[PDB]
Every structure is written in C-alpha cells, then in structure tokens.
C-alpha cells in the first residue's frame, strides 16, 4: 500500500522520526548544520523564500 | 495442464483526491502543450 | 491560422487518454 496511508488525519503521534532525519542530515554535512527543532526548521522554511521575494519585489 | 488461479493479484486503487490531482495535471498539460501541437 | 492539421486530434487524445485511465481507476476503486 501507499506509505501515505500510514498517516491518519488528526492523529496525535508524529508520522516521522525527526531524530533520524537529524542524524542523517548532520552526518551528510556536519552535526551543527542540521535542525533538531522542527519549530526552528519550519520558521527557516517560511522565512527564506518570503524574505527573498520581499527583496525582489 | 490446468489453469490455476494466480495468488499474486492485488487490487488497484485511485482515491478521489488522486483523481482530482491527475485530472488537473492532464488538463494543465493539455493547456500547456496544445499551442505547440497546433504550432 | 494555418495550424498543424494534426494539432486537434493530438490535443484531444493527449488529454482524453490519461483522463479515461484515471476515471477507470477511480470508478473501480473498492471492488
């Protein structure tokens, strides 16, 4: 089955392991270049293109 | 020799959201490439 | 306009064939 069916709309529990993602990414580059805080990561994701489009506008 | 039922058959599924996404994709691909087909 | 005389059949089929594929798959889901 599609892996997307492993998520249920409204579920309490997180659907992926951010710790594993951070281990991989902090080994891909270096530990300190990787986010361990989803809130900080989602802020960066929002801010970067938004700021870039503000500049181009 | 007999014709036995294969046990490897699986149902295929396309949910409604996938239908809408695929239809929009086909529509916009047609919108995009029609001008080039007519040239 | 002197368009490609094959443009209309091509556009119609380009859209209709994947459309019917999708419709067939969606309508039979749950069998």
């Amino acid at each position: 089955e599609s892996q997307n069916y492993g998520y249920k709309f409204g579920q309490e529990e997180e659907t992926y392991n951010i710790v594993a993602a951070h281990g991989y990414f902090g080994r891909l580059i270096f530990q300190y270049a990787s986010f361990n805080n989803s809130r900080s990561l989602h802020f960066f994701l929002g801010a970067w293109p938004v700021i870039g489009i503000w500049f181009t506008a | 020799m007999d014709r036995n039922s294969n046990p490897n058959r699986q149902p295929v599924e396309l949910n409604r959201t996938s239908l809408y996404l695929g239809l929009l994709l086909v529509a916009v691909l047609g919108i995009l490439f029609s001008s080039y087909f007519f040239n | 306009m002197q368009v490609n005389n094959l443009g209309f059949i091509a556009s119609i089929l380009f859209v209709l064939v994947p459309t019917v594929f999708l419709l067939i798959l969606f309508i039979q889901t749950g069998k």
């Binding site: 409204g10 | 959201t17 809408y20 929009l24 529509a27 919108i31 001008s35 | 556009s11 119609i12």
Partner: peptide, 30 residues
C-alpha cells in the same frame, strides 16, 4: 477552430477545480 480546443482544455481545468472544491473527499477525524 484551435480556439475551441483552447477553450475546452481551459474549461476542463476550471471544472476540475469546481468539483475538487465542492465535491472533495471530506477530511474526517479517525
């Protein structure tokens, strides 16, 4: 007549939008 083709594909896109909004799979809390 290529105008008919263009209007038809655009109309298909817009109608898909309408159906996807008005008749979507209702998200349910399970």
């Amino acid at each position: 007549m290529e105008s008919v083709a263009y209007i038809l594909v655009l109309t298909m896109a817009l109608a898909v939008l309408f159906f996807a909004i008005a008749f979507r799979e209702p998200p349910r809390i399970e």
